[PDB]
Structures are given as C-alpha cells and as structure tokens.
A = this chain, B = another copy of it.
Amino acid sequence: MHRTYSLRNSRAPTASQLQNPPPPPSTTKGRFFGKGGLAYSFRRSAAGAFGPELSRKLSQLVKIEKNVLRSMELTANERRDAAKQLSIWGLENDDDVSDITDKLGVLIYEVSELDDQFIDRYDQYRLTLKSIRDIEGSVQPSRDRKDKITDKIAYLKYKDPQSPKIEVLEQELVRAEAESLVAEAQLSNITRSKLRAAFNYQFDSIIEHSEKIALIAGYGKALLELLDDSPVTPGETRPAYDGYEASKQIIIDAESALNEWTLDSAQVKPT
C-alpha cells in the first residue's frame, strides 16, 4: 500500500531508507507454497467446507490465526534454542566476548519469554474471535430459515391465492421476521463489542510487547559498548576485561526498568 505513484510495486522509501539503503532480498525464499505444505493447508481447506456459509470467512480467519499462533510458537521456542546455542558457542572465546555473548543470549531469552506472553494474549484474541464466530454461526440458521420460508410462501402464492397453508406460513413468517430483527440487532451489538474489545486488547498487547522489546534492544545496544573493537596486533595480548561489574549493573538496570514498566509509563507517543 506504501507503493509510489508509478507502475512498480515499490514502496516509497522512508527517512530510514535514505539514511541506510535497503538490503537485497532474502535468499531464504524456497520453492514451496509457503503455507506449511498440504498438512498445514488441510485446516485451511477444511475451513472452506460445509459450514453455515456465514461464519465460513470468520472460521477461516480463526483457523488462519491458529496457523499464525503455531508459527509464532515455532519461532519462539526455537529462537530460545538459538540463544542457548549462542551461549554455548561463546563458552570458548575471549572473556569479554564470552560475557557479552552470554548477556545477548539472556536478552534473547527475555525476547522469547515476551514472545510467549504475546502468544498467550494472541490466544485471548483468537478465543474472542472464536466466540464471535460461534454466535454468528448460531444466528445464521435464523436467516436461513427465513429465506427458505419466504421462497416456499412465494411458490405457494404462485400455486393459488387462498391455501390455508399460505396464511399459516405468513403468520409464522411475521414471527420469524421479528425474531430475526432481534437476532440481527443483538448480532450487530455483540460483533461490534467483541471486535472493539478484542482488537483494542490485541493492539495494547502488541504495543506493550513491542515497546518492551525495543526497550530491551536499546539496553542491548548500550551494553554492546563494553567490548573494544580496536584491533590488536599479533603477538602481545590486550589488557584483560574487567567490565563485569558494568555489565551486571546494565542488566540490573534493565531488569529494574522491565519490572517498573507499566501502561502509564508508555513513552511511545503518537501524533
């Protein structure tokens, strides 16, 4: 949607893009459907199946959100595995390198834990959407019966103008219309309420998790200053790294700001 007014689907570069040019496209693009294969697309296909034809789209969205959740669960546990592997690799290295890589590993572990909490809040969002899907599916048969009744009464009117069955189904249809009006009014109310609440909670969760992980990334950037990037000539060895206390103080302050973080202290501000 950010594409410029040209013939190319090229997004307009932001100030960050001008500051640092965008990198080349990733080489990880594999020759695959990109939906987890037929095994993971079985759920997607089953979403588009014999349903109430009304919550079909909503049920499909819910099951797609379940796929989202499964993928995020896959990238959280295996990311914390990556952090563990990074610490294991940094075990046998320079003392400053080992300390700094262990601190980066623990920061990534914090990242994975926040991802898991975001996953739980995502499941709350998905459960609210499941509730709205189920109430919509329960309210659909009312309108289905309404459509069937109006079609049958139209056919009966075609057959003759004085069948008692005609008047009886008209009398039942005036009841069905009122019940369907009430059902659709409450359906609109519940859909609006669930939609607003679920998406407000979802956006609050994502902004909280994202600003928290950004607060973590800033602390990690500050921590990365401890190691010295000055190259050392072959032969003599550089002085030993004694910044253990500084790194521990940095991680302590990061923990303190992490625990102190609250919705009131949301330094992110729109304009």
Which residues of A are interface residues toward B (Cβ below 8 A)? Answer: 154-155, 158
Contacts and interface: CB of A to CB of B under 8 A. Distances in A.
A203 to B, nearest CB: 44
A155 B154 CA distance: 10
Contacts of A155: 158
A158 B158 CA distance: 8
Contacts of A158: 154-155, 158
A158 B156 CA distance: 11
A179 to B, nearest CB: 26
Nearest to A154: B158
A89 to B, nearest CB: 71
Contacts of A154: 158
Nearest to A155: B158
A158 B154 CA distance: 7
A208 B152 CA distance: 66
A155 B159 CA distance: 10
A208 B226 CA distance: 144
Nearest to A151: B158
A152 to B, nearest CB: 12
A230 B26 CA distance: 150
3 contacts: A154-B158, A155-B158, A158-B158
A147 to B, nearest CB: 14
A137 to B, nearest CB: 29
A155 B158 CA distance: 7
A148 to B, nearest CB: 15
A158 B157 CA distance: 10
A74 to B, nearest CB: 51
A166 to B, nearest CB: 14
A246 to B, nearest CB: 79
A8 B158 CA distance: 49
A98 B158 CA distance: 81
A155 to B, nearest CB: 7
A17 to B, nearest CB: 52
A177 to B, nearest CB: 19
A186 to B, nearest CB: 30
A158 B151 CA distance: 9
> Which 3 pairs from chain A and chain B are nearest by CB?
A158-B158, A154-B158, A155-B158
A97 to B, nearest CB: 77
